[PDB]
């Protein structure tokens, strides 16, 4: 809520991805904190298992509700940190409601 | 431009890509957002930081705001706590 | 300090080009036998695999930690 991206680059979302989709490289941000310089989910590689949703300790990477993201070009499907963070900002209100409804179950 | 200032350059052979199509960059960069966060004053020597909301936060850690010299910063939220 | 990964012999093919990819910056490799590391229980069996498959081999002898004598009483010796 403050505005600090949740991911702290533990990189086990990369470890458990079955398809090798997520690529993460990180370095200490000047703040001294730990953040990901590059976070790239290759959606064409991703098979939408939802384990990344499962694995994240801070729950920074989530399976968002939108299913309509069909794209004219293959490159658009590859997603870097800025698209995903932008995707996160757009759907945060519903993502928060969805996680709110299902967290007791998990 | 972006968080870690990605700047495909005037001479790069990749800046070709944005021609006729915009780049993905972020407003409200996070780098400055927690810096914009007030320092959580506390009474106790040590304090917790669930991240806010328990299960919907970060693995709870206890920060030692023991020296006013330094405001403890939970390695997860980047929230500074003022003893 | 665990030693369970220093038990079985492994033979690993020589490392090859890993150029950066222009579109996403991901590492890219043109060598198929790169990620392949076969595990063999004994030095003799691994050498055999190289000979029949025709790959060149350069075996490195196992080096195991030498026995080291330790005793809690010994360091309490003011003398030394």
């Amino acid at each position: 809520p403050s505005g600090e991206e949740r991911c702290i680059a533990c990189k086990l979302c990369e470890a458990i991805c079955p398809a090798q989709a997520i690529t993460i490289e990180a370095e200490p941000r000047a703040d001294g904190s730990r953040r990901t310089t590059r976070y790239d989910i290759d959606m064409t590689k991703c098979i939408y298992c939802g384990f990344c949703q499962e694995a994240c300790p801070v729950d920074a990477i989530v399976e968002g509700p939108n299913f309509e993201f069909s794209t004219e070009t293959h490159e658009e499907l590859l997603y870097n940190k800025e698209k995903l963070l932008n995707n996160g900002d757009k759907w945060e209100a519903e993502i928060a409601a969805n996680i709110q409804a299902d967290y007791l179950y998990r | 431009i972006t968080h870690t200032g990605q700047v495909y350059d005037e001479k790069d052979y990749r800046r070709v890509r944005f021609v006729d199509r915009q780049k993905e960059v972020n407003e409200n960069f996070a780098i400055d957002l927690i810096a914009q966060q007030p320092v959580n004053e506390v009474e106790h020597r040590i304090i917790a930081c669930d991240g806010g909301g328990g299960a919907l936060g970060h693995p709870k850690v206890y920060i030692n705001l023991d020296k006013e010299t330094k405001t403890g910063t939970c390695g997860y939220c980047g929230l500074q706590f003022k003893q | 300090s665990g030693v369970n990964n220093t038990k079985k012999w492994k033979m690993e093919f020589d490392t090859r080009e890993r150029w950066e990819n222009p579109l996403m910056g991901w590492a890219s490799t043109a060598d198929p036998l790169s990620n392949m590391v076969l595990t063999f229980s004994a030095k003799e069996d691994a050498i055999a695999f190289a000979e029949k498959n025709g790959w060149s081999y350069d075996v490195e002898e196992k080096k195991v930690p030498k026995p080291k004598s330790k005793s809690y009483g010994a360091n309490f010796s003011w003398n030394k």
């Binding site: 590059r38 790239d40 490159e75 | 968080h3 780049k23 | 579109l23 996403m24 910056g25």
Partner: peptide
């Protein structure tokens, strides 16, 4: 309730020596 372009966001990994512009 009452076209993107993908790119690498990391920096240059191996910086390159630049030749001295002073002639010798």
């Amino acid at each position: 309730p009452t076209q993107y372009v993908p790119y690498s966001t990391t920096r240059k990994k191996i910086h390159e020596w630049v030749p001295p512009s002073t002639p010798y």
